[PDB]
Amino acid sequence: YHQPRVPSSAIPIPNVSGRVPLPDSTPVPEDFKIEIPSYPYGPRRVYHQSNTGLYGSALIRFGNNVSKRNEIKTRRKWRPNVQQKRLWSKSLGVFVRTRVTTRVLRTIDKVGGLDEYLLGHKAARVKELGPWGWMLRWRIMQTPEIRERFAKEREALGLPPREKSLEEQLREFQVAGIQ
Amino acid sequence: GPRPTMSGATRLVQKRRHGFLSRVKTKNGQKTLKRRLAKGRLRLSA
Amino acid sequence: ATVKQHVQLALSLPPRLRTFLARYPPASILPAGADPETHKTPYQEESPNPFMPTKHPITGKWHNPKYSLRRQAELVKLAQEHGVEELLPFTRKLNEEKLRKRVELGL
């Protein structure tokens, strides 16, 4: 999709292909490329359209077109109510564009926004996300808000405080690129 | 009745239409080679 | 002499029972001057009765028992064929509990 620029971040919203191309204005030395961890459940082997949006567990379905009198069967299709929407991301502070089903719009309202819909750790959600949602999940995790929120939940669970962030690497490439 | 359809035929068209590369580089060509390989053919193409 | 024969009888039990009793030892076999509150194995601290569901304190969600009702009946059946059924914790699959509930309440 055509995504906006994050207000105060050099990392753009990933491409549905999984690539994070950086503008030439961002001085990055070759031998470097942003790599997103692979999606655990792999891509969807059917309905590849679902690998580029937030489709939940919805796919294209096949069945019959039973008639009235003789009940003659004829194959047909059932498509999900997919729509293109701009969804607010409190973490990024912009409108993330993506194709989403109406059932996933309700879940987003149920969990409390798009950011909350991506940070779920249950197995059912990671499957519903898909390759695309896995990228948006990776992106919001690079923000300072989620990094600060997770750092506060680690001490609450009794974990040690928590190497260099990606945003910092792109910052160090500037200071070293000009001189 | 049969016709002389090989009159004026060239061997550049044979290689393009039935040659080895015409088949390893396509999805349906790979099946042809794998079918002929299973049967034991020596001549897999052309 | 008899003490050595007793240890041999216990060591002759199937590994499945020796394992369970090792991590869920009842007060009967504990030392004489022992106390149930202490001497608890790491498993008994997580779940006093592994056959009953437990409500996690932090998260108000019931945790399934460490042994399903099918696996509970297998231990009762295995413990009854070796004479250690009275060493298992409370279970709705115990032969005495199944019978007591039928005689007391009936159909």
């Binding site: 790599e35 961890p37 692979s38 655990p40 940070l119 750790h121 999940r137 990776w138 995790m141 997770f150 939940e153 680690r154 609450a156 669970l157 009794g158 974990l159 | - | 003490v3 024969q5 007793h6 240890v7 041999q8 009888l9 216990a10 060591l11 039990l13 020796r18 394992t19 009793l21 090792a22 991590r23 030892p25 009967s28 076999i29 504990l30 030392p31 194995t41 790491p42 498993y43 070796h82 004479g83 250690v84 059924e85 009275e86 060493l87």
Partner: protein, 56 residues
């Protein structure tokens, strides 16, 4: 090359939530405790129950 493939399968560890990290850490501690052992004192008290319910 084999080490790069390994690190790739382990790349998602950076995308773990704090709860996921908490549970993965408890296993390392739980697995370290080991299995409780039956003392010869307790094994004897178990044999008394076996013989009592088998012979008398």
């Amino acid at each position: 090359e084999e080490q790069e493939k390994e690190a790739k399968k382990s790349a998602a560890k950076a995308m773990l939530t704090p709860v996921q990290e908490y549970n993965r850490k408890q296993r390392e501690l739980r697995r370290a405790r080991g299995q409780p052992a039956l003392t010869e004192e307790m094994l004897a008290k178990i044999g008394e129950v076996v013989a009592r319910n088998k012979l008398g």
